[PDB]
Structure 1
């Protein structure tokens, strides 16, 4: 019909296709879900990857006279042909009506085409908050909040991250069983209050595509659609509804025992205790005494692990069980050498903040061992 023409260098074409591969393939239930959408706009090519809830758009810059138009092509085969071709060879792409002709060097290929099957509005947001979160901000935020969130959990809302923008700062929270994560990033902009839940898979897609710690990003967050413009490329995801617990009700629980000191020492101790931790009940015991910590583990193999750590403490003698994996994720995502730890009770949530700054905080509900 309209016909399309392209002479696109391979290297500048791979990164968009490679990036948009997230919401592509992966058991396509329909003949249209497993395919990529191409369209020509002025001097740009938009590549759209869809899985009915996440839409990833890549903008390839066009440097040559290119015929306008749009089409739908099998995403996997297009990616494979664009990757296998010799480096630096410009690919000549033409729409032969029902077929998709692509030539390069001494090679020719044809593709099956779908005229128009995934072209609705595809997106509609509310945009309560439009913070220009720069790259490095959500980089550390998301790497410090993802952890290992809900899988198979009945509570659907616990899957996605909770964003709350207030004043000049955005607080990101995540609950999963015992573990809970929060980061209070000081955006610094006069921003309205907003609360939202984003799907976990959308979060991992955003973090993975993120990369490149230099460019400020535009984030438009509504009540059903969230859009993030990572430099050249665009991503959009749905939004999970409410019923999420308030971090203002699970973070501040009047901590009374305070502790400090090295984080990597705790990492090594936790790894060595995980060897002899209960393989059925993942978690070891923490004896808390004045300016002293003791970590003990007794696996079903009848092997006892004990270590001593110099952690400051001025409270009362305590014995708290905890999951090693959750707290190890806490330590690893804290990206710091020293941490602070607040104890409340053996059945009440235990907080762990960054000793470097208040920007990173965490909660682990203790174990009964």
Structure 2
């Protein structure tokens, strides 16, 4: 049965750590995308850090957590089904989790049982270039405060493409939504910010999933211009970053 005698990387990782690691990245995977390398989650190992990267070409999600054990740099793409069922079977955080990744198959020893899956042959893209390289605008807000405003705006949102325009002015944020029925929703929020007036229209479900993934109290958004991406993370850490590339509508 087990003919994968040699493994590329090995982990003895706490269950809660990988639970957060996947839960902070799962929603950004691609479901049955033509780009077969994007229909999965990239586990990346460098130093003592393990990162999960998931993108569908419209949103990127990267989450990094230390392990303590030094590991060689490695990359692997676990398909949608494998990672979803691994997440499902990942319960009972008391027992540790063993991970054994080879060049062609992945194994996860959870509690007492073993899980096996195959890999996606393709090579995952570099997410460092997707991350904006010159974030000149930085704004901060409250996670729940920002999230509830987005939900209220999303109530009257285009049901097909849930998109809102976010405007940033001095210590002020604006979220405007409209649907084919011209039903307009407008939410204004008090933030701390220093920069220039800028409008950017992006999806609502992606931002709401990003905010739900960051179960924090302070959120920092980094923006460059109206056309490039937005990098959202929490202000209490830098271990999880998200990239929302806007709409041109």
TM-score by length of 2: 0.95
Q: SS at 2:128's partner residue?
A: helix
Question: 1 CA distance for matches of 2:225 and 2:71?
Answer: 37
Q: Name structure 2 gaps, 5 residues minimum.
A: none
Distance 1:123 1:148 in 2: 33
* Larger of the two Rg values belongs to structure: 1
Distance 1:301 1:166 in 2: 50
Q: How does 1:1-369 map to 2 (within 5 A)?
A: 121=1, 124=4, 126-369=6-249
CA distance in 1, matches of 2:79, 2:3: 16
Q: Secondary structure at the match of 1:234?
A: strand
Question: Quick check: which one's strand share is greater?
Answer: 2
**1:152, CA displacement in angstroms?**
2.9
Q: Distance in 2 between matches of 1:162 and 1:126?
A: 20
| Partner SS state of residue 10, structure 2 | coil
Query: Does structure 1 conserve the Cα–Cα contact (< 8 Å) formed by 2:31 and 2:80?
Result: no
Structure with bigger RCO (C-alpha 8 Å, 6+ apart):
2
| TM-score, length-scaled by structure 1 | 0.65
Contact 2:28–2:61, Cα closer than 8 Å, also in 1: no
How far apart, in 2, do the equivalents of 1:145 and 1:286 lie? 23
TM-superposed deviation, 1:148? 4.9
**CA distance in 1: counterparts of 2:133 and 2:80, whole angstroms:** 26
Q: 8 Å contact 2:132–2:224 — kept in the other structure?
A: no
Deviations 1:182-214 (A, max 9, x none): 111011111111111111111111111111122
Q: 1:351 to 1:127 in 2, by over 3 A?
A: same
Decide whether aligned partners of structure 1 residues 126 and 257 sit closer, same or farther in structure 2, where only a CA change above 3 A counts. Answer: farther
CA displacement 1:35-89 (0-9 Å, x = unmatched): xxxxxxxxxxxxxxxxxxxxxxxxxxxxxxxxxxxxxxxxxxxxxxxxxxxxxxx
Q: Deviations over 1:199-230 (max 9, x none)?
A: 11111111111111222211011221000101
Unpaired runs of at least 5, structure 1: 1-120
RMSD after superposition: 1.5
